[PDB]
Amino acid sequence: DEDETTALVCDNGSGLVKAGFAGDDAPRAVFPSIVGRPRHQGVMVGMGQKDSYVGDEAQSKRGILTLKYPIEHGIITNWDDMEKIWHHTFYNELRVAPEEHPTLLTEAPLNPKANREKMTQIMFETFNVPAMYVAIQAVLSLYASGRTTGIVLDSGDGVTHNVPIYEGYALPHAIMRLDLAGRDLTDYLMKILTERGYSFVTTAEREIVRDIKEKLCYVALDFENEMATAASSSSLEKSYELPDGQVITIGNERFRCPETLFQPSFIGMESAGIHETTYNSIMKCDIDIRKDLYANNVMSGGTTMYPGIADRMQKEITALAPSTMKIKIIAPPERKYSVWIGGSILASLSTFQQMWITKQEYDEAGPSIVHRKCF
Amino acid sequence: DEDETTALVCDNGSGLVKAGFAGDDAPRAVFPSIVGRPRHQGVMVGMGQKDSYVGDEAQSKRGILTLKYPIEHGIITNWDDMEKIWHHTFYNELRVAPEEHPTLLTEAPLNPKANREKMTQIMFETFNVPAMYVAIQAVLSLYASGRTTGIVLDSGDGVTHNVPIYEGYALPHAIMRLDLAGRDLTDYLMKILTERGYSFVTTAEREIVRDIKEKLCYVALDFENEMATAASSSSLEKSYELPDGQVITIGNERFRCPETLFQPSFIGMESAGIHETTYNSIMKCDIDIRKDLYANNVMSGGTTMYPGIADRMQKEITALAPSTMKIKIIAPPERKYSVWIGGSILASLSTFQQMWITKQEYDEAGPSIVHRKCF
């Protein structure tokens, strides 16, 4: 339905896919990274029932479906399901497809090599894209934030990367890969809500919990004070209506789940916590770099939407950082949608038009070309 | 009749409850977790007729009683009925009044908190027990089974908990609680027997089916080949005599019902099955842990009593498992009675005499005390 001869952009994780076309400042639509399948045998005639559901179809009908997510902590392994997700995304809902447009897909800086190779290959071989470019989420996070310099706290669905860039250059030894993201926070909340008498086991139930979390949970500027009160009084509880007519209230659990980011030990993870990983991405860089990264701590990805996170991360780093120097967190409304936006910026910059793999070079070289042309 | 203030121990499941005193190796008495109520008025003289029936009384007169189980998927929701069960259990069959003896009760690691609070509160406020301690079923399973390390599959009536333990420590990031249990197998068997012409729809009938299941059913080491044979020949059928003199036989139904453990979709549950659930508990654990958990897969609770479950589970995990690793299932005669036995072991350990909540600490703190004192 679109007639603008621009690039297309998609951010694909273990939870959601943000997508739209390059040159704008927002995705046109956001789809779940889901291929749904019926988990029941139909009995009655005229009950519909699809063999497969894609994206929002899968999420909307989830009460009777098993929901599969193709991306594992940042890597696409089920490329067949991503092809279905991308077809729906582009052809059915965004109303624009790669066949007539160059396409940019994103990944984390240390994401296994197979991910960028398959993203490049599927757009060229199943979507017939005229050109490709696999982007680094850290690059996109700073473009969308108005920075060339800063720490990218790309807290996604399956992984948080924690990666510094200075004057446009990577500082890779200072990357603190962390196995804690929005999907793990959802799983933890399912377990602590089970402790409250509301067990959540199935994937439809996981989606209910993700909705509860996104609307009711927060990290808190001061965890212990919120905890002591919330664990002692109903005045700190918030109600949510479950899609069966039950009402669930959440007290200190409302923040204990989100707290996992600062205390990963809550889910059995071996990690110093998001504020120390942020601190180390700054501290492991050279001393004439450190000061600029402290002043430019940039949030991207989701989980950045928890109340108290932009104020808390600044508090936790300034408390570890030396005095006089100003420590600042950048946390715009483009929060969680900023990686897509950065993709739009990179794809459309004139300074990037020589970075695209055309369907010339790709056909002669094959998918290994991504390591010659992208990064 | 005891010459020491030994703790009394009660393993109260959603199905059956086992009881005895600490220091024994078996419960002294077993009761269903049932309080029965008549739905009919008796006519004949000399027919008993009570307002309510407890434990074995509910089963003996069940033909006209509604049988209520006060425990729902591991949690007591009806505390009045548990008081009837505990009075009868401790006072009439164990012959001990709790007033002069400490009491140990059990719950799953993710059992809703209100369960531990009521178990503790009832014994302190209604029975005046001098002390209380709510045990972890995973611990008790390991102490009865002779292990400190392994996978605990406690396959109870209301829930299969599924928790890996290493060197006496929980590995909570790998708990995969499953809402598929012995109660669903009984309900499914009532329905599959109905398909064969033997309808079971009442509470009395539920108990009849429960007895049929326990004596006639098995999982089969190869479902499809056993099914094809059972569906083709009477050689795999087994008879049972019903209370009214009718005879029921079970064919491939004999395993199609138990198969629900491996295929939960049969009862409408979204799950990969007990063997993938078990496997999910062994691979998610750390690289230097996995080998010890594979070699120590521990069964406790009932359903573990199906003739082919220890061998099929060992086979399924072996099939999912990497090579080199030794896969072994421990399926002791203390099966279904293991949690109670572990309770006896725990209550009497010298290392556990400081873990008891006294009826001093309890009254000063209130029912929530169990949260900080037990686990």
Place this chain on the structure above:
Amino acid sequence: LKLDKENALDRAEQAEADKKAAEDRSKQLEDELVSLQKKLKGTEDE
């Protein structure tokens, strides 16, 4: 019949007692076998 529940029960109990001694041996032997096999593989790997 008069003493047959007793003969059968004594057989059941004696068989259960022997079964258990032998089942406990089976578990002990299996655990030793598996550990021994792991020692075997330990040494075979070596």
